[PDB]
Coordinates of C-alpha atoms in Angstrom, one line a residue:
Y3 CA -0.6 -13.4 -27.7
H4 CA 3.1 -13.8 -27.1
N5 CA 5.6 -13.4 -24.3
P6 CA 9.4 -14.2 -24.5
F7 CA 9.5 -15.6 -21.0
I8 CA 6.5 -18.0 -21.8
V9 CA 7.2 -20.9 -24.1
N10 CA 4.7 -23.7 -24.6
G11 CA 2.5 -22.8 -21.7
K12 CA 5.5 -22.6 -19.3
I13 CA 7.3 -19.7 -17.7
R14 CA 10.9 -19.7 -18.8
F15 CA 13.0 -17.2 -16.8
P16 CA 16.6 -16.5 -17.4
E17 CA 18.7 -17.7 -14.4
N18 CA 19.2 -15.2 -11.5
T19 CA 15.8 -13.6 -12.1
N20 CA 14.2 -11.1 -9.8
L21 CA 12.2 -7.8 -9.9
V22 CA 15.3 -5.7 -9.3
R23 CA 16.8 -6.8 -12.6
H24 CA 13.5 -6.1 -14.4
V25 CA 13.4 -2.4 -13.3
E26 CA 17.0 -1.9 -14.3
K27 CA 16.2 -3.1 -17.8
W28 CA 13.4 -0.5 -18.2
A29 CA 15.7 2.1 -16.7
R30 CA 18.1 1.4 -19.6
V31 CA 15.8 1.0 -22.6
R32 CA 12.7 3.0 -21.5
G33 CA 14.6 5.4 -19.3
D34 CA 12.9 8.7 -20.3
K35 CA 9.4 7.2 -20.1
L36 CA 6.9 7.5 -17.2
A37 CA 7.3 4.7 -14.6
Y38 CA 4.9 5.8 -11.9
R39 CA 2.5 8.7 -11.5
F40 CA 1.1 9.8 -8.2
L41 CA -2.2 11.7 -8.4
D42 CA -2.0 13.9 -5.3
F43 CA -5.4 15.1 -4.1
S44 CA -4.3 16.3 -0.7
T45 CA -4.5 20.1 -1.3
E46 CA -5.6 20.4 -4.9
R47 CA -9.1 19.0 -5.7
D48 CA -8.2 18.5 -9.4
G49 CA -5.1 16.6 -8.4
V50 CA -1.4 17.2 -8.7
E51 CA 0.6 14.9 -11.0
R52 CA 3.9 13.7 -9.4
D53 CA 5.9 11.8 -12.0
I54 CA 9.0 9.8 -12.0
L55 CA 10.7 8.3 -15.0
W56 CA 12.4 4.8 -15.1
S57 CA 15.8 6.4 -15.1
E58 CA 15.0 8.6 -12.1
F59 CA 13.2 5.7 -10.4
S60 CA 16.2 3.3 -10.7
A61 CA 18.6 6.0 -9.3
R62 CA 16.4 6.5 -6.3
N63 CA 16.1 2.7 -5.8
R64 CA 19.9 2.3 -6.0
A65 CA 20.5 5.3 -3.7
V66 CA 18.3 3.9 -1.0
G67 CA 19.6 0.4 -1.6
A68 CA 23.2 1.5 -1.2
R69 CA 22.3 3.3 2.0
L70 CA 20.7 0.2 3.4
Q71 CA 23.7 -1.9 2.4
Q72 CA 25.9 0.4 4.5
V73 CA 23.8 0.5 7.7
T74 CA 21.9 -2.8 7.7
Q75 CA 22.9 -6.5 8.0
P76 CA 22.1 -9.1 5.3
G77 CA 18.8 -10.8 6.1
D78 CA 17.5 -7.8 8.1
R79 CA 13.9 -6.9 7.7
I80 CA 13.1 -3.4 6.4
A81 CA 9.8 -2.1 7.6
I82 CA 8.1 0.5 5.4
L83 CA 6.1 2.9 7.5
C84 CA 5.2 5.3 4.7
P85 CA 2.0 7.0 3.3
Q86 CA 0.8 6.1 -0.2
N87 CA 3.1 8.0 -2.6
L88 CA 6.2 7.7 -4.8
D89 CA 8.6 7.3 -1.8
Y90 CA 6.6 4.3 -0.7
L91 CA 7.6 2.5 -3.9
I92 CA 11.1 3.9 -3.6
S93 CA 11.2 2.4 -0.1
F94 CA 9.9 -1.0 -1.2
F95 CA 12.1 -1.3 -4.3
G96 CA 15.0 0.3 -2.4
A97 CA 14.7 -2.5 0.2
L98 CA 14.7 -5.1 -2.6
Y99 CA 17.7 -3.5 -4.3
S100 CA 19.6 -3.7 -1.0
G101 CA 19.1 -7.5 -0.9
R102 CA 17.3 -7.3 2.4
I103 CA 13.8 -8.3 3.3
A104 CA 11.2 -5.6 2.7
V105 CA 8.0 -5.3 4.8
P106 CA 5.4 -3.0 3.2
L107 CA 3.3 -1.5 6.0
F108 CA 1.6 1.9 6.7
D109 CA 2.0 5.3 8.4
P110 CA 1.4 5.2 12.2
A111 CA -0.1 8.6 12.0
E112 CA -3.0 7.2 10.0
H115 CA -4.4 0.9 13.7
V116 CA -1.3 1.9 15.6
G117 CA -1.3 -1.3 17.7
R118 CA -1.6 -3.7 14.7
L119 CA 1.6 -1.9 13.5
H120 CA 3.1 -2.8 16.9
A121 CA 2.1 -6.4 16.6
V122 CA 3.8 -6.8 13.2
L123 CA 6.9 -5.1 14.4
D124 CA 6.9 -7.5 17.4
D125 CA 6.5 -10.3 14.9
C126 CA 9.3 -9.6 12.4
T127 CA 11.5 -7.3 14.5
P128 CA 12.8 -5.0 11.7
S129 CA 16.2 -3.3 12.2
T130 CA 15.3 -0.4 9.9
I131 CA 12.2 1.6 9.1
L132 CA 11.8 3.5 5.8
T133 CA 9.6 6.6 5.7
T134 CA 9.5 10.1 4.4
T135 CA 10.9 13.4 5.9
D136 CA 7.3 14.7 6.6
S137 CA 6.3 11.4 8.2
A138 CA 9.6 10.9 10.0
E139 CA 8.8 12.6 13.3
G140 CA 5.5 10.7 13.6
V141 CA 7.3 7.4 13.0
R142 CA 9.9 8.3 15.6
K143 CA 7.0 9.2 18.0
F144 CA 5.5 5.7 17.4
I145 CA 8.9 3.9 17.9
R146 CA 9.9 5.5 21.2
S147 CA 6.7 4.0 22.7
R148 CA 8.4 0.7 22.0
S149 CA 11.1 -0.9 24.2
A150 CA 14.8 0.2 24.1
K151 CA 15.7 -3.3 22.9
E152 CA 16.0 -1.8 19.5
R153 CA 14.4 1.4 18.3
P154 CA 14.8 0.5 14.7
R155 CA 16.7 3.2 12.9
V156 CA 14.5 5.6 10.8
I157 CA 15.5 6.6 7.3
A158 CA 13.7 9.3 5.4
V159 CA 14.3 7.9 1.9
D160 CA 13.6 11.2 0.2
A161 CA 16.5 12.6 2.3
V162 CA 19.0 10.1 0.8
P163 CA 21.0 11.8 -1.9
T164 CA 20.7 10.3 -5.4
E165 CA 24.5 10.4 -5.7
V166 CA 24.6 7.6 -3.1
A167 CA 23.4 5.2 -5.8
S168 CA 27.0 5.1 -7.1
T169 CA 27.9 2.8 -4.1
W170 CA 25.1 0.4 -4.8
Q171 CA 26.0 -3.3 -5.1
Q172 CA 23.7 -5.6 -7.1
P173 CA 22.5 -8.4 -4.8
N176 CA 18.9 -15.7 -5.0
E177 CA 15.5 -16.8 -6.3
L178 CA 14.5 -19.0 -3.4
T179 CA 15.3 -16.4 -0.6
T180 CA 12.5 -14.2 0.8
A181 CA 12.1 -11.0 -1.1
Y182 CA 9.6 -9.5 1.3
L183 CA 7.0 -10.2 4.0
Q184 CA 3.3 -9.8 3.1
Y185 CA 1.3 -9.3 6.3
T186 CA -2.4 -9.8 6.0
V192 CA -1.6 -12.6 15.9
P193 CA -0.4 -11.2 12.6
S194 CA 0.9 -13.5 9.9
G195 CA 3.6 -12.6 7.4
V196 CA 3.7 -14.5 4.2
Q197 CA 7.3 -15.1 2.9
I198 CA 7.3 -14.0 -0.7
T199 CA 10.5 -15.0 -2.6
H200 CA 12.4 -13.3 -5.3
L201 CA 11.0 -15.9 -7.7
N202 CA 7.4 -15.5 -6.5
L203 CA 7.3 -11.9 -7.4
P204 CA 8.3 -11.8 -11.1
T205 CA 6.5 -15.1 -11.6
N206 CA 3.1 -13.9 -10.4
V207 CA 3.1 -10.5 -12.1
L208 CA 4.0 -12.3 -15.4
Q209 CA 1.0 -14.6 -14.8
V210 CA -1.1 -11.5 -14.5
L211 CA 0.3 -9.9 -17.6
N212 CA -0.3 -13.2 -19.5
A213 CA -3.9 -13.4 -18.4
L214 CA -4.5 -9.7 -19.2
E215 CA -2.8 -10.0 -22.6
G216 CA -1.3 -6.6 -22.0
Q217 CA 0.0 -4.8 -25.1
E218 CA 2.8 -2.2 -25.3
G219 CA 0.7 0.9 -25.4
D220 CA -1.5 -0.1 -22.4
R221 CA -1.3 1.5 -19.0
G222 CA -2.5 0.8 -15.4
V223 CA -4.5 2.6 -12.8
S224 CA -4.9 1.9 -9.1
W225 CA -6.0 3.3 -5.8
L226 CA -5.5 0.2 -3.8
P227 CA -3.3 0.5 -0.6
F228 CA 0.3 -0.6 -1.1
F229 CA 0.3 -2.5 2.2
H230 CA -2.3 -4.8 0.8
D231 CA -1.3 -7.6 -1.5
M232 CA -3.7 -6.6 -4.2
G233 CA -2.4 -3.0 -4.0
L234 CA 1.2 -3.9 -4.1
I235 CA 1.2 -6.4 -6.9
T236 CA -1.1 -4.3 -9.1
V237 CA 1.4 -1.5 -9.2
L238 CA 4.4 -3.9 -9.3
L239 CA 2.8 -5.1 -12.6
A240 CA 4.6 -2.1 -14.2
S241 CA 7.9 -3.8 -14.0
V242 CA 7.0 -6.7 -16.3
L243 CA 6.6 -4.8 -19.6
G244 CA 7.6 -1.3 -18.5
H245 CA 4.0 0.0 -18.5
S246 CA 3.3 3.2 -16.6
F247 CA 1.0 3.0 -13.7
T248 CA -0.9 6.0 -12.3
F249 CA -2.1 5.7 -8.7
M250 CA -3.8 7.7 -6.0
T251 CA -4.5 7.1 -2.3
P252 CA -7.3 4.9 -1.0
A253 CA -8.7 8.0 0.8
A254 CA -8.9 9.9 -2.4
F255 CA -11.0 7.2 -4.0
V256 CA -13.3 6.8 -1.0
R257 CA -14.1 10.5 -1.0
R258 CA -14.3 10.9 -4.8
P259 CA -14.8 7.5 -6.6
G260 CA -15.1 9.3 -9.9
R261 CA -11.4 10.0 -9.8
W262 CA -10.8 6.4 -10.4
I263 CA -13.2 6.4 -13.3
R264 CA -11.7 9.6 -14.6
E265 CA -8.1 8.2 -14.6
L266 CA -9.3 5.0 -16.3
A267 CA -11.0 7.0 -19.1
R268 CA -9.3 7.7 -22.4
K269 CA -7.1 10.7 -22.4
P270 CA -6.8 12.8 -25.6
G271 CA -4.7 10.9 -28.2
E272 CA -4.7 7.7 -26.2
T273 CA -5.1 4.6 -28.3
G274 CA -4.0 2.0 -25.8
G275 CA -6.1 0.3 -23.1
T276 CA -6.3 0.6 -19.3
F277 CA -6.1 -2.0 -16.5
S278 CA -7.1 -1.8 -12.9
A279 CA -8.3 -3.9 -9.9
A280 CA -10.6 -3.5 -7.0
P281 CA -12.6 -5.2 -4.2
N282 CA -16.3 -5.8 -4.7
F283 CA -17.4 -3.0 -2.4
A284 CA -15.6 -0.4 -4.6
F285 CA -17.8 -1.4 -7.6
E286 CA -20.8 -0.6 -5.3
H287 CA -19.2 2.6 -4.3
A288 CA -18.2 3.8 -7.8
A289 CA -21.5 2.8 -9.3
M290 CA -23.4 5.0 -6.8
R291 CA -21.0 8.0 -6.5
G292 CA -18.6 7.7 -9.4
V293 CA -20.8 8.8 -12.2
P294 CA -19.7 12.2 -13.6
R295 CA -21.9 15.2 -13.0
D296 CA -23.5 16.9 -16.1
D297 CA -21.1 19.9 -15.7
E298 CA -18.1 17.6 -16.1
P299 CA -16.2 17.0 -19.3
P300 CA -17.0 14.1 -21.6
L301 CA -16.0 10.6 -20.3
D302 CA -14.8 7.9 -22.6
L303 CA -14.4 4.4 -21.0
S304 CA -14.2 2.6 -24.4
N305 CA -10.4 2.2 -23.7
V306 CA -10.8 0.2 -20.5
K307 CA -9.7 -3.4 -21.2
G308 CA -9.9 -5.0 -17.7
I309 CA -11.0 -4.0 -14.2
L310 CA -10.3 -7.1 -12.0
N311 CA -12.8 -7.7 -9.3
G312 CA -11.5 -9.8 -6.4
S313 CA -10.5 -10.2 -2.7
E314 CA -14.1 -10.7 -1.6
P315 CA -17.3 -12.5 -2.8
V316 CA -18.4 -10.8 -6.1
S317 CA -21.9 -9.4 -6.0
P318 CA -23.9 -9.8 -9.2
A319 CA -25.9 -6.8 -8.2
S320 CA -23.0 -4.5 -7.7
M321 CA -21.5 -5.8 -10.9
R322 CA -24.7 -5.1 -12.9
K323 CA -25.1 -1.6 -11.3
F324 CA -21.5 -0.8 -12.1
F325 CA -21.7 -1.9 -15.8
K326 CA -25.1 -0.2 -16.3
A327 CA -23.8 3.1 -14.8
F328 CA -20.7 3.4 -17.0
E329 CA -22.0 1.6 -20.1
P330 CA -23.3 5.0 -21.5
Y331 CA -19.7 6.2 -21.3
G332 CA -18.4 3.4 -23.5
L333 CA -17.5 0.7 -20.9
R334 CA -17.7 -2.7 -22.5
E335 CA -19.5 -5.6 -20.8
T336 CA -16.2 -7.5 -21.2
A337 CA -14.3 -5.0 -18.9
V338 CA -15.1 -6.1 -15.4
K339 CA -13.3 -9.3 -14.5
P340 CA -14.2 -11.4 -11.5
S341 CA -10.9 -12.9 -10.1
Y342 CA -9.6 -15.0 -7.3
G343 CA -6.4 -14.9 -5.3
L344 CA -4.7 -14.6 -1.9
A345 CA -1.4 -13.6 -0.2
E346 CA -0.1 -17.1 0.0
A347 CA 0.0 -17.2 -3.8
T348 CA 1.7 -13.8 -3.9
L349 CA -1.6 -12.5 -5.4
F350 CA -3.1 -13.7 -8.6
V351 CA -4.6 -17.2 -9.1
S352 CA -7.4 -16.9 -11.6
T353 CA -9.5 -14.4 -13.6
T354 CA -12.2 -14.2 -16.1
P355 CA -10.9 -14.5 -19.7
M356 CA -10.5 -11.1 -21.4
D357 CA -12.8 -11.7 -24.4
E358 CA -15.6 -13.1 -22.1
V359 CA -18.3 -11.4 -20.0
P360 CA -18.6 -12.5 -16.4
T361 CA -20.1 -15.9 -15.9
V362 CA -22.9 -16.1 -13.3
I363 CA -24.9 -19.2 -12.4
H364 CA -27.3 -20.2 -9.7
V365 CA -27.2 -23.3 -7.6
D366 CA -29.5 -25.0 -5.0
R367 CA -28.9 -23.7 -1.5
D368 CA -29.6 -27.0 0.2
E369 CA -27.2 -28.9 -2.1
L370 CA -24.7 -26.0 -1.7
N371 CA -24.5 -26.4 2.1
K372 CA -23.9 -30.1 1.4
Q373 CA -20.8 -29.3 -0.7
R374 CA -22.6 -29.9 -4.0
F375 CA -23.2 -27.7 -7.0
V376 CA -26.6 -28.3 -8.6
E377 CA -27.4 -25.6 -11.2
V378 CA -30.9 -24.1 -11.0
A379 CA -32.8 -21.3 -12.7
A380 CA -32.4 -17.8 -11.2
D381 CA -36.1 -17.7 -10.6
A382 CA -36.0 -20.7 -8.3
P383 CA -37.0 -19.8 -4.7
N384 CA -33.9 -21.3 -3.1
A385 CA -31.3 -20.3 -5.7
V386 CA -27.9 -18.9 -4.6
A387 CA -25.9 -16.9 -7.1
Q388 CA -22.3 -18.0 -7.8
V389 CA -19.9 -15.9 -9.8
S390 CA -17.1 -17.6 -11.7
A391 CA -13.5 -16.6 -11.0
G392 CA -12.4 -17.7 -14.4
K393 CA -9.3 -19.7 -15.5
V394 CA -6.2 -20.4 -13.4
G395 CA -3.1 -18.6 -14.5
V396 CA -0.2 -20.1 -16.4
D397 CA 2.2 -22.4 -14.6
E398 CA 0.0 -22.6 -11.4
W399 CA -2.5 -25.2 -10.4
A400 CA -5.7 -25.2 -8.4
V401 CA -7.3 -28.4 -7.2
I402 CA -10.5 -29.1 -5.2
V403 CA -9.6 -31.4 -2.3
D404 CA -11.3 -33.5 0.3
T405 CA -9.1 -32.4 3.3
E406 CA -9.6 -35.6 5.2
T407 CA -8.3 -37.8 2.4
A408 CA -6.1 -35.2 0.7
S409 CA -7.6 -36.4 -2.5
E410 CA -9.0 -34.5 -5.6
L411 CA -12.8 -34.2 -5.8
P412 CA -14.8 -34.5 -9.0
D413 CA -16.2 -31.4 -10.7
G414 CA -19.3 -29.9 -8.9
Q415 CA -18.3 -31.1 -5.5
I416 CA -17.0 -28.5 -3.0
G417 CA -13.7 -28.9 -1.1
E418 CA -10.7 -26.9 -0.1
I419 CA -8.7 -25.2 -2.9
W420 CA -5.1 -26.3 -2.8
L421 CA -2.5 -24.5 -4.9
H422 CA 0.8 -25.3 -6.6
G423 CA 3.1 -23.0 -8.6
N424 CA 6.2 -20.8 -8.6
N425 CA 4.1 -17.8 -7.4
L426 CA 3.4 -19.5 -4.1
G427 CA 5.1 -18.4 -0.9
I428 CA 7.4 -20.6 1.2
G429 CA 5.8 -20.0 4.7
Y430 CA 4.7 -17.6 7.4
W431 CA 7.5 -15.7 9.1
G432 CA 8.6 -17.3 12.4
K433 CA 5.6 -19.7 12.4
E434 CA 7.0 -23.3 12.1
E435 CA 3.8 -25.2 12.7
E436 CA 1.4 -23.0 10.7
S437 CA 3.9 -22.9 7.8
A438 CA 4.0 -26.7 7.7
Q439 CA 0.2 -27.2 7.8
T440 CA -0.4 -24.6 5.1
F441 CA 2.6 -25.1 2.8
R442 CA 3.6 -28.8 3.2
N443 CA 0.8 -30.9 1.8
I444 CA 0.7 -33.8 -0.7
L445 CA -2.1 -34.5 -3.1
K446 CA -2.5 -38.2 -2.4
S447 CA -5.1 -39.0 -5.2
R448 CA -6.2 -37.4 -8.4
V449 CA -9.4 -37.8 -10.5
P450 CA -9.2 -39.1 -14.1
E451 CA -9.3 -35.6 -15.6
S452 CA -7.2 -34.0 -13.0
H453 CA -6.8 -30.2 -12.6
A454 CA -3.4 -31.1 -11.2
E455 CA -2.3 -32.5 -14.6
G456 CA 1.0 -30.9 -15.3
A457 CA 2.0 -30.5 -11.7
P458 CA 4.5 -32.9 -10.1
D459 CA 2.8 -35.9 -8.4
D460 CA 4.9 -35.5 -5.3
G461 CA 5.0 -31.7 -5.3
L462 CA 3.9 -29.7 -2.2
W463 CA 0.5 -28.0 -2.2
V464 CA -0.6 -25.0 -0.4
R465 CA -3.9 -24.9 1.5
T466 CA -5.9 -21.7 0.9
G467 CA -8.5 -22.0 3.6
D468 CA -11.2 -21.5 0.9
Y469 CA -14.0 -23.8 -0.2
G470 CA -14.4 -24.0 -4.0
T471 CA -15.3 -26.1 -6.9
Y472 CA -14.9 -26.6 -10.7
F473 CA -18.0 -26.4 -12.7
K474 CA -18.2 -26.5 -16.5
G475 CA -14.7 -25.2 -17.0
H476 CA -14.9 -22.4 -14.4
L477 CA -13.4 -22.1 -10.9
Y478 CA -15.9 -21.0 -8.2
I479 CA -15.1 -19.7 -4.7
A480 CA -17.7 -20.9 -2.4
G481 CA -16.3 -19.0 0.6
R482 CA -13.8 -19.1 3.4
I483 CA -13.8 -22.2 5.6
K484 CA -13.2 -20.5 9.0
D485 CA -16.0 -18.0 8.2
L486 CA -18.6 -20.7 7.9
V487 CA -21.6 -20.3 10.2
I488 CA -22.3 -23.7 11.8
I489 CA -25.7 -23.9 13.5
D490 CA -27.2 -27.1 14.9
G491 CA -24.7 -29.2 12.9
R492 CA -25.6 -27.5 9.6
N493 CA -23.5 -25.3 7.3
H494 CA -24.3 -21.8 6.2
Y495 CA -22.2 -19.5 4.0
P496 CA -22.2 -16.1 5.7
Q497 CA -22.4 -14.1 2.4
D498 CA -25.5 -16.2 1.5
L499 CA -27.2 -15.2 4.8
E500 CA -25.9 -11.6 4.4
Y501 CA -27.4 -11.4 0.9
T502 CA -30.8 -12.7 2.1
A503 CA -30.7 -10.3 5.1
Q504 CA -29.8 -7.5 2.6
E505 CA -32.6 -8.3 0.2
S506 CA -35.2 -8.7 2.8
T507 CA -35.2 -5.0 3.6
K508 CA -34.3 -1.6 2.2
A509 CA -33.0 -0.6 5.6
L510 CA -29.7 -2.4 5.3
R511 CA -26.7 -0.7 3.6
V512 CA -25.4 -2.7 0.6
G513 CA -22.3 -4.7 1.6
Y514 CA -22.4 -3.8 5.2
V515 CA -24.0 -6.8 6.8
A516 CA -22.2 -9.4 8.9
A517 CA -23.5 -12.9 9.7
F518 CA -21.7 -15.0 12.3
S519 CA -22.4 -17.3 15.3
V520 CA -22.0 -16.8 19.0
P521 CA -22.3 -19.4 21.7
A522 CA -25.6 -19.0 23.6
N523 CA -24.1 -18.4 27.0
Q524 CA -22.0 -15.5 25.5
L525 CA -25.0 -13.7 24.0
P526 CA -25.7 -10.3 25.7
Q527 CA -28.5 -9.8 28.1
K528 CA -30.2 -7.5 25.6
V529 CA -30.9 -10.6 23.4
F530 CA -32.7 -12.5 26.2
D531 CA -34.7 -9.4 27.0
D532 CA -36.1 -9.6 23.5
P533 CA -39.0 -12.0 23.1
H534 CA -38.4 -12.2 19.3
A535 CA -35.1 -13.8 20.0
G536 CA -36.7 -16.9 21.5
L537 CA -34.0 -17.7 24.0
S538 CA -33.7 -18.0 27.7
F539 CA -30.3 -17.6 29.5
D540 CA -28.6 -20.8 30.4
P541 CA -25.0 -20.4 31.7
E542 CA -23.9 -23.7 30.2
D543 CA -25.7 -23.6 26.9
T544 CA -22.8 -23.2 24.5
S545 CA -24.7 -23.9 21.2
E546 CA -23.9 -21.6 18.4
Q547 CA -26.5 -18.9 17.8
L548 CA -26.9 -16.9 14.6
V549 CA -26.2 -13.2 14.9
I550 CA -26.6 -10.6 12.1
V551 CA -25.0 -7.2 12.3
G552 CA -25.9 -4.6 9.7
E553 CA -25.3 -0.9 9.0
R554 CA -28.3 1.3 8.3
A555 CA -28.8 2.4 4.7
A556 CA -28.5 6.1 3.8
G557 CA -31.4 8.2 5.1
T558 CA -33.0 5.4 7.0
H559 CA -32.0 6.5 10.5
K560 CA -35.6 7.4 11.4
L561 CA -37.0 3.9 10.4
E562 CA -38.1 1.8 13.3
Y563 CA -36.0 -1.2 14.3
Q564 CA -38.6 -4.0 14.8
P565 CA -40.1 -4.2 11.3
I566 CA -36.5 -4.4 10.0
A567 CA -35.5 -7.1 12.4
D568 CA -38.7 -9.0 11.7
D569 CA -38.2 -8.9 8.0
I570 CA -34.6 -10.1 8.2
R571 CA -35.5 -12.9 10.7
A572 CA -38.5 -14.1 8.5
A573 CA -36.4 -14.2 5.3
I574 CA -33.5 -16.1 6.9
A575 CA -36.0 -18.5 8.5
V576 CA -37.9 -19.3 5.3
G577 CA -34.8 -19.3 3.1
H578 CA -32.1 -21.0 5.2
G579 CA -34.1 -22.9 7.8
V580 CA -32.2 -21.2 10.6
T581 CA -33.3 -18.7 13.2
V582 CA -31.6 -15.3 13.8
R583 CA -31.3 -14.8 17.6
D584 CA -30.2 -11.2 17.3
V585 CA -30.3 -8.4 14.7
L586 CA -28.1 -5.4 15.6
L587 CA -28.5 -2.3 13.6
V588 CA -25.6 0.1 13.9
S589 CA -24.7 3.4 12.4
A590 CA -22.7 3.7 9.1
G591 CA -19.0 3.0 9.5
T592 CA -19.3 1.3 12.9
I593 CA -18.8 -2.3 11.6
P594 CA -15.1 -3.2 11.9
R595 CA -13.2 -3.4 8.6
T596 CA -9.9 -4.8 7.5
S597 CA -7.0 -2.7 6.3
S598 CA -8.1 -3.2 2.7
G599 CA -11.8 -2.4 3.4
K600 CA -13.3 -5.9 3.7
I601 CA -15.8 -6.6 6.4
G602 CA -14.0 -8.0 9.5
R603 CA -16.5 -10.6 10.7
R604 CA -14.2 -11.8 13.4
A605 CA -13.5 -8.3 14.8
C606 CA -17.2 -7.6 14.5
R607 CA -18.0 -10.8 16.4
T608 CA -15.6 -9.8 19.1
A609 CA -16.9 -6.2 19.2
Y610 CA -20.4 -7.6 19.5
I611 CA -19.7 -9.9 22.5
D612 CA -17.8 -7.3 24.6
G613 CA -20.5 -4.7 23.9
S614 CA -18.2 -2.2 22.2
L615 CA -20.3 -2.5 19.0
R616 CA -23.5 -1.4 20.7
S617 CA -21.8 1.6 22.5
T623 CA -10.4 3.3 9.1
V624 CA -9.5 5.3 6.0
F625 CA -12.5 3.8 4.1
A626 CA -15.2 6.0 5.6

C-alpha cells in the first residue's frame, strides 16, 4: 500500500493543511464526479437519489462560507441544527470554509433540552439549517432568552453566486466542537485531516472504492465516516438513521455490488446494528439478487462487540458473498477525533476468552471457551499510524506490562486539545505525562515528555492485540469488588430467552435509594435502612419479541441465579420494561446513567432508534 502523505510510517502533511483545502482539490481534479449521495426514503420506499458533484459541493461550501464571513465574527461558533441530508454537510463544510468554529448538532423538531444545554455551553452566534426546518428552529430559539437569539440561516437559500466573495481562511486552532452537563471536544484543523488519513491508511482504500453510511452526522462516528470522502475523493452514499432502523436491508442493499462495480465498499456501525441487520436485514425471496462479495470492510465500534451478533451477522450474509474478513472490530472515541484502532483488513476478527475472576482483578488469563467462568474478549486490532495507545496504572502514571489492565492513554495528532470552556476537565483529560515505560513500550516512537490523553477506558495489550475491557465510570462496584457491566449483562442475557438482545443494563444503586418495590420483594433479600448506602446491583432489561405474556418471576429467578453462580454477586432487583423504554444515547447506545436515574425517580417503571 502507498499514500503520498505517509512516508516511513509517518504522516507528512504539506504546511497549512486542513479539510477545506482537500475538498477544493477534488473540486478541481475530480469536479464532475459524485461527492455525496443522499438516499432519501422519506416519501419513496425505494429511495430517491439526491446527488452532488465535487464542483457543485465546493460552490455551495464557498457560498455558505462567504455568507458566514459577512455576518459572523472570527471565532464564532456556528451551530448546525439540520436534519440528515446534503445541506447538513454543506452547513458543516460551509462553517469550516468560513474559518469559524462548526458545531454539528441536530433538528429540534426531532431531545429538545439537550440541544438547549449545548447552546448554553458554546453560545453560538449563528445557526445553520434548511428552509423547511427553518421555522421549527426559530420556534426552538425564541423559547431561549433575548440575550442573543442566534441568527438563523437556511443554507439552501444562500445563492451559489455568493461563493465569488469567499475568502480562503491555522492547524492548531479549533475546527469544530464535537459534543458527545454536555462536553464539547475541541477538534483542530490538524486533527481532522490527520484522523481520516489514519482511517484511509488502515482500510487500504483504493481509487475505485466507495463508502456507505447511515450513522447520524451529529455523532463522531457518523461525521468522520462521511468526511472520509475528502481524503481520496471517494464518493459516499448515506441515508438517515431512521431509514436504517425501519429497514436495515437498505444498508445491506447499498453496500452490495451494483452492476459493473469492480471496486469495494466501506462502512461503519455500532454493535447493536449488526444485531439489527442480522435479524431484519436479510433480503426477502422476492427481492433481486444480492452480491456482498464487494464489501471490503464494515467497521464495528463505539460499544462492546458481541461475538454472538458478529457470528449471526456474518452467517446471515455469508450466502450473499460476504467475506469473513469484512466485519472489523474497532476502537475509538471523540477525544481522538474518532479512529484509534481496527482489525487488520486481511484478518478475521480475533476473539479470545479470559478468566472472569482474574479479569475483575485487572488481569488477562486466557482460557478455553468451554470454561465455566470464561468471559469473551474481542480484539480491537492495531493502533493507527502516527498515534499511540498505552496501558497505564493511573496512580503511578506508568506503563503496565502486556496482559495487565489499566487506563488507555493516547498520543497523536488526531487528538483534541480540550473540552470547550472546561479548564479543569481539559487539564485532567488532556495534560498527562507518561512517567515510566516498560522495556518493550507501546509508546515507542512517541516523545518521552509529550502530553497524553486519558480515555476513561480500561484496556490491555495481549499477544499483539489491543483489547477494550470497558469504561471505568461504568464499573459496577459491589462490596469492594469489580464487575464489568457488559459481563453481567451478557450473563443476564444468556440466562433467559425473555431478554431482548443488547437491551439489558447493569448498574448499582445505594441501598437507601432503592424503591419500596424492591423491599416488598422477598427475593431481593433486603430490608429498608435509611442510612445503608452500600451499592446494590440492579438489572434493567427489555422484554424480547413476543414474550410479553411470559411471567416475571421465573425470568427474574433465572437472571438472579446465573449472576449469583457466575459472578458471586446478588441482584437486588430485576426490572422488566417494554421495548424502547430503556434510555438510549443520541447514537443508539444504552444509556446506563440515564437508565439508573430513570430507575431511581420511578419514571422507568411508569429516540429515533425505535
